Amino acid sequence: MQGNNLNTPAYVKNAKLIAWVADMVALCKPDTVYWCDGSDAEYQRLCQQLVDAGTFKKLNEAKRPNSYLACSDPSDVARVEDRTYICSAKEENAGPTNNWMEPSEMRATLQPLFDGCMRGRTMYVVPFSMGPLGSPIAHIGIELSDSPYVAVNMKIMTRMGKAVFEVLGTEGDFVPCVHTVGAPLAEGEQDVTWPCNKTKYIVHYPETREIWSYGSGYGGNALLGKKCFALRIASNMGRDEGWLAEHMLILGVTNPEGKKYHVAAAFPSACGKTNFSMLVPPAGFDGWSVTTIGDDIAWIKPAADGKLYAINPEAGYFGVAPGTNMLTNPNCMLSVRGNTIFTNVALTDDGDVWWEGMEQDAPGKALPDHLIDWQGKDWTPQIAKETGAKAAHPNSRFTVAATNNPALDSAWDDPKGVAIDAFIFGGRRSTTVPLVTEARSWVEGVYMAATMGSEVVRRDPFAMLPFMGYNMSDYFQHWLDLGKKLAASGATLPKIYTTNWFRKGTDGKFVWPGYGENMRVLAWMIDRIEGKGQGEDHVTGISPSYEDLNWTGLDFSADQFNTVTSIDKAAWLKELELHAELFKQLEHHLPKELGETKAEIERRLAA
Ligand SMILES: [Mn+2]
């Protein structure tokens, strides 16, 4: 009778899973339970349900085929870090970068909120694989959600549906995820187009891998595979099992001889992982190609051959729309030509979408005369001047399948992963940090990643500040020990670089053109990996000289280059003071190796 009241499909053979779904249905009390099979027809039917509710508007089929626009409640527009918790058994295993609560107290807080939360709604059972299906390195999650928006976005972002239960079999384990918009409906009550609750919780219980999300229907709060599972829970699993879950793009780069390298790169917002992961080689780089394995999350495991192998556990892109155009990211623009869900962007008079930055592709770079903004209001360039209103919300999004990307790498879903030749850690700094620096050693590269900041300078170690599943200082130790254990196997460790696209010149403008021209920095990294690139040893590492880069096709002078690449001792003395402040905030439980690196920089500054 239980299984019959859950509408359990015949292909679900896993008794532990069914028992858990039954417990959550008993708690949440949905009116009906629907198991998502992941079919295209199911996706279309759910999209139609969203249209019928007013959550979606279907975009013009001649402008933007099979695409939809959703606009959210203005209270529910982004991840809410202050409402996100790591509820480890001990507070020290959440650490200073995480919000903590004793698990039993949090369970007592969440039980009355989830009791009956889905009254008047359908519970969607969303099975998904993070990583290629059936693979030895993939992990299965099940998200229960009362939002059809979550179901359709999860279809794009993960490997979702019936095929999961063949991999789960009768006894396979899974990450249990529960999500509610926190808006139960009474009989005859008219629903809103974007149900949500002012009260929000996004809770992780690491010891049981549970994720509970209440009150938001948006993005990283509600699509639980992306951040909650693939970074917060997965980082915990990696620490116990010897692998890494990182906030990194993964790209392949092939030179004209056909030699292929892979790079994993973490940016806090610098560049945009999305821009760099889909980089188009500029003039001077005929015969080179750049391909995308992923644009956001990397799972990385050492193999017996002494190499680090990365996979992208996601299946689509959930990208920030504003700023995207054919100059900053043509592969992304081409990706969103159709089959895309857009959230909180603007609506044009011909039933297409618009966002700030798209005018860069228009004749004269002219803004549109009129739009409907993401709040449903009339928008014009005059109105924008008078109210300051942006047409698209700054955190507005596109959701699109990886296979829409013309630069998708052939191995993007290869379960064996790709060997990482270099890590890159970015950051937006007007001063101090060179365009590119190679770390002299693994430990010094870890120091660079641990101390990376973005502009006042906010520190975001490894770009993981909002996403660490356990104590940040223990995570630094995990990186150091992984490198040590690999080097002890004889392995050659990946190079580590820091980049900075955002040094300002004496006129306050960015000197480095960026976007496709970042290929010229990537090509120096490749030369270094091959042992053919030259560089200047300085206080913090090795940086190219002007003559070490390929300038074919770009008018960029030696003085411009030295303006963004030279190091200054006064600036780095001030920078080390800021590192000291960060280390105090991390309560000095830091690995001794980070202290030794700081001391060695200080010695070079005083020599
Ligand atoms: Mn991200």
State how far the Cα of 371 lies from the Cα of 577, in Å rounded to an integer: 48
CB atoms within 10 A of CB 286: 9
State how far the Cα of 447 lies from the Cα of 552, in Å rounded to an integer: 34
The residues facing 291 across adjacent strands are: 252
C-alpha distances in angstroms, 187 versus 49, 181, 408? 19, 18, 48
Asked if 51 and 66 count as a contact pair (C-beta separation under 8 A), the reply is no
247 CA distance to ligand 1 centroid (A)? 6
HEC profile for 425-476? Answer: ECCCCCCCCCCEEECCCHHHHHHHHHCCEECCCEECHHHCCCCCCCCHHHHH
Residue 156: exposure state from Cβ atoms within 10 A (0-12, 13-18, ≥19): buried
Q: Which pair of tokens denotes residue 592?
A: 């001794």
Residue 339 is assigned to a ligand binding site: no
> Would you kindly state where each structural domain of the chain is located, as residue ranges?
2-55+79-243, 248-295+421-606, 317-403
Q: Which pair of tokens denotes residue 305?
A: 């051959």
Resolution in A: 1.6
- Equal fold, 2-55+79-243 vs 248-295+421-606: no
State how far the Cα of 424 lies from the Cα of 438, in Å rounded to an integer: 9
Yes or no: is domain 317-403 CATH 2.170.8.10?
yes
Residue 270 is assigned to a ligand binding site: yes
Three-state DSSP class for residue 291: strand
Whether 271 sits among the annotated catalytic residues: the reply is yes
State how far the Cα of 378 lies from the Cα of 375, in Å rounded to an integer: 9
Q: CATH: 3.30.1370.60, 1.10.3860.10, 3.30.530.20, 3.40.449.10. Which one for 2-55+79-243?
A: 3.40.449.10
Residue 104 is assigned to a ligand binding site: no
State how far the Cα of 333 lies from the Cα of 358, in Å rounded to an integer: 10
Cα 557 vs. chain centroid, distance in angstroms?
Answer: 35
From which experimental method does this structure derive? X-ray
381 CA distance to ligand 1 centroid (A)? 31
Q: Which pair of tokens denotes residue 232?
A: 């917060």
Q: Which pair of tokens denotes residue 112?
A: 């009355």
312 CA distance to ligand 1 centroid (A)? 13
Residue 516 is assigned to a ligand binding site: yes
Asked if 260 and 250 count as a contact pair (C-beta separation under 8 A), the reply is no
Three-state DSSP class for residue 50: helix
461 CA distance to ligand 1 centroid (A)? 14
Cα 5 vs. chain centroid, distance in angstroms?
Answer: 37
Asked if 536 and 542 count as a contact pair (C-beta separation under 8 A), the reply is yes
State how far the Cα of 130 lies from the Cα of 138, in Å rounded to an integer: 6
Residue 227: which of 458, 19, 463 has the closest Cα? 463
Contacts 24+ apart (CB under 8 A), 560-563: 560/505, 560/511, 561/435, 563/503, 563/505, 563/506, 563/511
Amino acid at 101: M
CB atoms within 10 A of CB 37: 18
CATH number, span 248-295+421-606: 3.90.228.20
Asked if 345 and 374 count as a contact pair (C-beta separation under 8 A), the reply is yes
290 CA distance to ligand 1 centroid (A)? 20
The residues facing 319 across adjacent strands are: 398
Exposure string of 511-532, with b = 16+ CB inside 10 Å and e = fewer, is bbebbbbbbbbbbbbbbbbeee
Q: With the C-alpha atoms ordered 428, 440, 312, 144, is the resulting torsion angle positive or negative?
A: negative
Residue 396 is assigned to a ligand binding site: yes
Q: Which pair of tokens denotes residue 535?
A: 């560089």
C-alpha distances in angstroms, 302 versus 4, 153, 308, 502? 44, 31, 4, 33
State how far the Cα of 532 lies from the Cα of 253, in Å rounded to an integer: 17
Candidates 47, 87, 177, 271; catalytic one: 271
State how far the Cα of 605 lies from the Cα of 607, in Å rounded to an integer: 6
The DSSP secondary structure of 97-114, one letter per residue, reads TSB---HHHHHHHHHHHH
